[model samples]
Target: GSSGSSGFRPHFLQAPGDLTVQEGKLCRMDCKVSGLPTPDLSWQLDGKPVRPDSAHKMLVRENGVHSLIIEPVTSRDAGIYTCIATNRAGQNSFSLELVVAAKESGPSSG
Candidate 1:
């Protein structure tokens, strides 16, 4: 006997694009992927694994929509992120960059 989870190749149904978020604002990336046997999902930042923390979150909808959330986005959160889905058939990935912009400020006009 052999161990193999036969399934279809994972494909991105809806992928997120590059996004710009203002500092102190929430940053969210929503994506959808489909495959047989339900492919495993993972997130990477700059080709490295993205660890969940108090400021970061990973969520999935009942309808297969996946999302990454960043509470109060900061300059440090600006980077290229990759969402990888893998299955027995194959693997697929979606990449996007998050640009964190400073809050708007202007000269005193009082």
Candidate 2:
């Protein structure tokens, strides 16, 4: 016999998209995901684990929306960012790239 809701694997309802931000500016990326047991979330930058700090913050909304905030984005921050969600059912992930526009230097004199 079939039982009740056994939950389902994690899936991205609205995956985050690539972003382009100017250097020294704030950057925010948001996404939505659904899971049975409230899948755990984590972030990675160029395959390296990323954690929240004074400059970086992670937020979760009541509507199951998640956001990653980065203030004063630098050139070094431009890279592939991956969001990983995992639960007992299974794991899912999404990746996006951050493009940083360098500050305007000198005017064209040529």
Candidate 3:
């Protein structure tokens, strides 16, 4: 009998979708991928590993999907965040551009 894992290839990886958030607000984005034997998901910010911080939160689901949450977003949070997924067969990567915009207030009377 031959191992089913042999010569198995996963779909080509694509970067996560870009996200926009207002300053001094919360931002959330989900990173999901499909593969056999569910791959491991990890995150990186500006090419650096992301660790739990006061402003950063990483949540992983039992299904191998993960989400990155940023609180009270600021200009410093705007950058390329890469999501890497890997399994026994191979590894794939994706990036998301985080844009920060000023918070809008209620309209004023003319």
Candidate 4:
């Protein structure tokens, strides 16, 4: 179904999707949404807005799909991320939990 701009309703909103990664690894997830007149996409982690940092990267495309990349994932990175898409009509949100496990250390210790 198409959401016409007359009402500014969101046509579709993609789920956050689950992610699994080990410590010191990279995790990538995409948050996509479709709506009329384009919807503003923002991410929130553990009920906090995502801040731009060396470990967190967020990219918004012309198609309204927001991509998030996390580098050197750690246990602290594990949390529920909420993606919100909003337009003049209304707003929609989706959430997903990210799991980050401890990585096994290599046998390089003397």
Best by lDDT: 1
TM-score of each candidate structure, all chains considered together: 0.83, 0.84, 0.76, 0.82
Model 4 whole-model lDDT (C-alpha atoms): 0.77
Candidate ranking (lDDT, best to worst): 1, 2, 4, 3
Candidate 2, residue 46: lDDT: 81
TM-score of 3: 0.76
Lowest lDDT 10-mer window, candidate 1? 1-10
Give the Å error, residue 105, model 2.
3.3
Q: Kindly list the per-residue Cα lDDT of model 2 for residues 1-110, writing each as its tens digit.
A: 54645667788988766688988889988788888657777889888998888878989877556888999788988998888889667899987888899977678652
Expressed as tens digits, the lDDT of each residue in 66-108 for candidate 4 is: 7889897879889988767787778887768888888777887
- Which candidate has the highest TM-score of all? 2
How would the candidate models be sorted by TM-score, starting from the highest?
2, 1, 4, 3
**lDDT: the better of candidates 3 and 4:** 4
Candidate 2, residue 54: the lDDT equals 83
Residue 6, candidate 4: C-alpha displacement in angstroms: 4.2
Model 2 alpha-carbon miss at residue 100, Å: 0.4
Backbone clashes in model 4, listed as residue pairs: none
Q: Stretches of candidate 4 above 4 Å error? A: 1-7, 11-13, 106-110
**For model 3, the run of ten residues with the poorest summed lDDT:** 6-15
What tens digits encode model 3's per-residue C-alpha lDDT throughout 1-110?
75665432234343456778889989987665667676776778888888868989888777666777889788888999876777767887776788899767668652
Assess candidate 2 and give its TM-score to the true structure: 0.84
Clashing pairs in 3: none
